[PDB]
Amino acid sequence: QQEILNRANEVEAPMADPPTDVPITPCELTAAKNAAQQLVLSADNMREYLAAGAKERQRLATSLRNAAKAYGEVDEEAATALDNDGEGTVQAESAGAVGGDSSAELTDTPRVATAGEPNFMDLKEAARKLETGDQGASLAHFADGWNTFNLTLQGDVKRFRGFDNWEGDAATACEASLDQQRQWILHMAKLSAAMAKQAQYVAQLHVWARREHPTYEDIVGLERLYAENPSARDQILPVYAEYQQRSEKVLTEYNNKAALEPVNPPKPPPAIKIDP
Amino acid sequence: QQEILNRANEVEAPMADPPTDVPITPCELTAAKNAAQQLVLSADNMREYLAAGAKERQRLATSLRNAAKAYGEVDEEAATALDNDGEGTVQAESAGAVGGDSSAELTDTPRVATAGEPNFMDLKEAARKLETGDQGASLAHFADGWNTFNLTLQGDVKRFRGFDNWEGDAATACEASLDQQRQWILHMAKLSAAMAKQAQYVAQLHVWARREHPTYEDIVGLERLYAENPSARDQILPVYAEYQQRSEKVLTEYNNKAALEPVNPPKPPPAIKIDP
Amino acid sequence: QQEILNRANEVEAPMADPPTDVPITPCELTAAKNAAQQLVLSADNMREYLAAGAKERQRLATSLRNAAKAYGEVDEEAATALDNDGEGTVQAESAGAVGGDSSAELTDTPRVATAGEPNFMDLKEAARKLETGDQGASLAHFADGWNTFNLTLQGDVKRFRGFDNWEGDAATACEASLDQQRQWILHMAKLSAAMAKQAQYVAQLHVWARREHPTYEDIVGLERLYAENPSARDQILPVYAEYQQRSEKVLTEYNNKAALEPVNPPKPPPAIKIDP
Amino acid sequence: QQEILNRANEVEAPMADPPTDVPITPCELTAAKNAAQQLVLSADNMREYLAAGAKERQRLATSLRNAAKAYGEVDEEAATALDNDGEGTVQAESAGAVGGDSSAELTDTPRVATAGEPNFMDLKEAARKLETGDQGASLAHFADGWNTFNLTLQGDVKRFRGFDNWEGDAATACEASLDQQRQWILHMAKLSAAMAKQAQYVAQLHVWARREHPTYEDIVGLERLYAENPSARDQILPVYAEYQQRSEKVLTEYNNKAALEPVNPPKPPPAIKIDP
Amino acid sequence: QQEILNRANEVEAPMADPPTDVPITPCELTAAKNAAQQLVLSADNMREYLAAGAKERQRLATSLRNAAKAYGEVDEEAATALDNDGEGTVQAESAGAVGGDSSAELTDTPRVATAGEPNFMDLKEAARKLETGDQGASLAHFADGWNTFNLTLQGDVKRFRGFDNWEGDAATACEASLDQQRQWILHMAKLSAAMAKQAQYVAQLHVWARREHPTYEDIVGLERLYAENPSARDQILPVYAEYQQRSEKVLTEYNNKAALEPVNPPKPPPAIKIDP
Amino acid sequence: QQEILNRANEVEAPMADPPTDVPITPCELTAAKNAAQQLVLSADNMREYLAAGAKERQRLATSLRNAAKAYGEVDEEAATALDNDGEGTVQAESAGAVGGDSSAELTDTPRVATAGEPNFMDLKEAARKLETGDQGASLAHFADGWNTFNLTLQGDVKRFRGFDNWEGDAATACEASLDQQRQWILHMAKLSAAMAKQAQYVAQLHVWARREHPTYEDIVGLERLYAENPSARDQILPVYAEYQQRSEKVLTEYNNKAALEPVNPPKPPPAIKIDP
Amino acid sequence: QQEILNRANEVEAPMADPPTDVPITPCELTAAKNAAQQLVLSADNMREYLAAGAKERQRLATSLRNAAKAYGEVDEEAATALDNDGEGTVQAESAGAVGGDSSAELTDTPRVATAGEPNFMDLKEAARKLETGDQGASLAHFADGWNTFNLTLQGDVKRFRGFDNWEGDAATACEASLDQQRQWILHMAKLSAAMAKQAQYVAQLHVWARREHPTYEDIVGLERLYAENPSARDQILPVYAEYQQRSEKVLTEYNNKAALEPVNPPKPPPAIKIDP
């Protein structure tokens, strides 16, 4: 009996609280906002599916506990029958059958699509809008956290690898479903890795965009230095144009290279019912 | 009952409006026009096939709803039969069979072939004809949009992955047809990617052609600078010839490298009828 | 009935008129002439086989139309039988069997072999004989056209991919033969590509030969410049010899590298007869 | 009989005492501490599992000895029976069946997770905190020892490769379980190699971090040299900033590149019971 | 009947006269002579086997014609029988069986082995002996011709690809033997390619040997220039020695690198007899 | 009979005396000593196993000779029986069965493990301790000898490849066991190669260690040259330190790169008994 | 009958006399002598096995001739029987069975092992001992000859590829054994190639050794030039030492790189007996 309960406790091992949310700092770029919304919604779906997973972890626990509960009812009847036979009391009762319990529901969230064509931005406009925010440290730590959670899910799969001293049909069925939950949590670990990589692709391009896009300090240089003589003004407008071209170029590379693939987790294997 | 209706609603999820048309700006080049016509006709076929797809999405919805409608008729008869048996009224009626509903038709459009031999163009002719149009931003955004729609079709396939609590022959058949529509929409996503790539091949060559083909500013240079002394005039005609050779060379590379493969989408899997 | 006729019309879709002939301009080189004759004869065989193909396209059309004609005869008899049974006229007639129609013949053309050993040519001889012709633009456009026709045959295969609402043995047989004609036209598209590539190998070597073979302008230089002093005349003959060696070298490379493989198309799948 | 005992002695061959613990010296870095805790806990699990392994080595010994003990009981009865038959004493006794003995329990230890986001450190802070500890010699020798223990486990597997002159069902079963223990010890040798490699990945990054991270001697240089004139002070703050950036950069590389995979050993194959 | 005769004519298509013989010009080198003898004997065997091939081409023709002849005898008897039955003349005759005709014999030629060790030659000896002959143009054109004959045999295989309107056992057997002759002629085309390549290996080394071996003009230089002062005579003998070493070196490379593999053609598939 | 004896002699072919022992000269390095002990113990096991191999070579000889001896007993009885039947003496005797003979025992030697952490050595300490010994010529010749013995064992396998004119069950069994001994000796040849390679890995590192480790002559230079002025003494201690670092570095590389894998030979296939 | 005799003659085709012996000139090097002895003994075994091969070639000839002889006896009896039946003489005789003839024996030669450790040689000692012999021309021509004999054996296999007009069990058996002898001679051709390659490995190292080992002319230079002043004598001994080191180095490379693999030919397939 207790062996079932020990394993029920194992599959109830509290999942470590998952990674935190993703502020992206005041980086006023449409593309950055769209990529961020996609990363956040994928993260939300993962934490929603892990909640149902936890219910299934708990259902396997509960299935072990309600198999044990149902079997507790059976054992009380068996002990009663043994006392009736030992004492020689009254007519023995006919055999029957007993079931187990229930699961969880997942929220159907929306996904964010990017613009069919990003709006054209001015040089110093974009330089300023990128300049007022950060280096992407918030996203970077999101990616870091989400990546370290690969291993926490991978570690959590290990709670479903087996059970002690339990045989019948219910035992066989539970073994299979523990293995399914084991593998599923591992899969969620892999999905964790996938999203972390997508977050890294975005962060890598954020950095690339800051490295190549004209900086606000370059805008300051354009304001402080100025070749105002007529024939030199004819060179200034090209100076501006070269930086404007770099702005367009770099924002385009960000728009393309920061593209990411949506995460679509499978539902956790529903435990099936307990055989009697 | 409602489970069928919930899934019928899922497969009715409105497809996002598809990408817009392709102006190519006043770039007066025969080759550009032919490539453009091919890209447009392929896009038209894709949106035509997606309309029938949407009808099939709706037919799977409708098949679920008319399976449910037909079954609604069955359940009303069943409930009536139960009331007749409970009350002890009149003779029970003989069993029969009931079907479901219909689909959509695709337009057979023409496809555009290129010239068997492009016409020879003069240097400044071609320079001017390319110069008066744009950089291919319209086509580039077509390619961008069409490429982002890969993922919207890929996302839309997910509405056909399953159903809740429905068993019989009709249920089995619908599952298979939902999977077929799922995979087909995914295929259309892949065709979206294919066309976007063909549009990119054209756009890449458009850019290459502008980078290598003598520019109208080079024509301006040929008009403003002119080595008019006799023995130097004997060098001017070679200056002209070198640019004329580059014109021919580059237009030839455009003619070849901007070639593209026609898109030929398969029809959406027609849902088959509902079993009774 | 009409469904058969609609598909019969589809397989009658006029094949675009095939590419034009190959003048090679007055480039008086034996090797060029032999390569050209081989390319022309292969092109002739392809257009001859496509004519029988068109007859088979038409025979599949005609097979659909004469299946329909034969079935028209059957349906008139069936309708007549129904009127006889409805009215109660005279004795019903015994069942029988009805066939369909015919095909096309291909011309057995000769193929041209090259010389077992090309004749030795003089420097200025060969320079002049190459100089009087063109750059191979005619052949280049042949290759271009023949290559664009790959896609027109590949497009034409699509007219044989299917049929609507027709079942029996004749229907099954026609489906198979439509697929065979489909694939065959595709094969002809591939043969089109093959010949275009062989034409390109010849054109590439033509260009290479003009780039490396001493030009007639080099002959003009040899006539205008001349180191006539005795000990310098002893250097002139080596000048001549070096160009003569280049002539021999380059013509040899043309002779080898412009070699091409003969095209040998398979006959179009003959449609088999209509079952009754 | 003795052959069983000789092999029982073989599988009792004392396992060499395993590698020692891992002090990491006063290197006050959170990341170093977390990596160290993970390496230590993996080492503890390996030595815990090897203790149960040793019990199973001893159980195979004991299984051979208690098979021999049980068989000793059998042989005493057999000899007694032979004396009864030789002398012609009393009625022979009925045959029965005899079993064997028991195993070991493994401690369920906790595993250490790293921080979701490491804390930002100051230049000279981190330089000092790394500077006060060592070169990682303790960890390096841990890795060395743990790696040399690969071969001691690999050597210890060889004690379970076979047995002499023993046939029945018990013999067959023991052979299989000796092979399982053989292979398991080899597996533990491989796990030894795995952990040694993870320790090496940490040590390699420790060294890399010391090579690239600004040293305390660089901090001494920053304190001793100082361009105190106003416009040069405007360069000093950048000097500081460049080293601060290197500090951040290098600690980040340590945080990432010193990441390691947890070791999760399988339990030693439990010997099954002795057949009679 | 005529269909058999049409195909009999096809397989009689005259094989183009094969390539000519191989003079090697007065290049007095033992190695050159041995390589040449091997190439010639392989060529002779190929033309001998092609003669039997032509007999088998003719036998397939003849087998078609004598199947037709034998069948001609059968048809005359059949027509006679029909006239006897139509008129009602005399007793019908018993059925029997009729055969067909014969083939060709190949000459068993000797093959030439090279010397077990080539004789040592003097510098100017070898220079002169190579100098008096040509550049290997004769061999080069042999190789050219033999190589162009690959395609003539490959073309000739096509005459054996099929037959029109002929069914029975004899027809089936002939089809198989036509395919065998088809493939065999193709094989002979491949053997043609093989020998051409061996001839090319020899020709390539001939050229290499002339490029590296001291030329007779180098011998002329050694005779015209001569550092006759005592201590310079001590340098002249080394000048001689260096060229003598190059002579030995180069002749050795020719001896090795011009080695070639003997051609050993299979006999043409003998047509088997005609079934009645 | 004699055929068995001829083959018995073949399998008795004296194995060449195996390679000699491994002095490592007075190179006072712990690591060198440990590597040497491992190489020696592996060599001892190989020569111990080859002694049992030789017993099995001799047992196959002996099995052939005692099969022949046992058969000699059989043939004497057969000849006796023939004389009894020819003469008509007395009652024939009943048939029976006869066996063959025995094998060899291998010494269970200890294996040497390396230190869990090598002791830190001083610069000139280690330089001197390496300096007083040799270049590893003794080990090098051990490796040489052991490697040439690969081929002597490989040659010795050939004595077990077959037998002449011997049929029955005993013959079949012996053939199989000769093949097993053949292959085993080959395996021992491969083990010879393995150890030679391990000895070479050690010797290669010995050389590397002498090439990179500061030499005693470098110590002599450190004693003879000495920048004794105060501020130069501040450079001398760094001179010392650089060499001390090289000492540590190089000894560490020796410790790692001279690591080797223990040899573990399989026992020679025991010949099984002779069938009668 | 004659067809058997024609093929018997074919398999008797005289094998070309094999390559000659290997003098190695007075190159007084132990290693050279050992390598030479190994090459010679392998060559001897090959020519010994080819002699038995020739006996088997002759036995296949003889088997064809003694099958024919035995069949000659059969045919004389058959003809006699036919005359007895034609004339009506006396009682026909009972059928029986007739066999065929015999083979050859191979010499069991010794093989030469190299020294377990080559003796240390002095600089000028070794220089002189190499200097007094040749360039390895004798060995080189051995390798050349042995290599050209690859093709003579490969050519000789062709005499065993088939037979004309012979059917029964004996015919089938002979066909198989001719194919076995065919393939075996080919194998011997491959063994010829193998030994030639081993001879080439030795010759290549001989040359390498002469190129790198100090020459006797270098010894002459050491005797003629001599920096006799005290402090320069301290440089002379190093001059000597550098050449002595090169001597040791190069002789070691010869000792290793000139190592070769012994050739071990299989016996020629013994023809089996003729069936009657």
UniProtKB/Swiss-Prot annotation, chains A, B, C, D, E, F, G:
The encoding gene: espB
Species this protein is from: Mycobacterium tuberculosis (strain ATCC 25618 / H37Rv)
The keyword Secreted is annotated on this UniProt entry: yes
Modifications after synthesis and translation: Cleaved in the C-terminal region by MycP1. The exact location of the cleavage sites has been the subject of conflicting reports. Likely translocated as a full-length protein into the periplasm, where it is proteolyzed by MycP1. Proteolysis may serve to limit the secretion of other ESX-1 substrates.
Broad class of the protein's primary localization: secreted
Miscellaneous notes: BTP15, an inhibitor of ESX-1 secretion, decreases secretion of this protein without being bacteriocidal. BTP15 inhibits autophosphorylation of MprB with subsequent up-regulation of espA and decreased secretion of EspB and EsxA.
Sequence segments annotated as region (Disordered): 82-106
Domain notes: The N-terminal region contains a fused PE/PPE homology domain. The C-terminal region is disordered.
Protein name, per record: ESX-1 secretion-associated protein EspB
Keyword annotations of the record: Acetylation, Secreted, Virulence
GO cellular component: extracellular region
Record keyword Acetylation present: yes
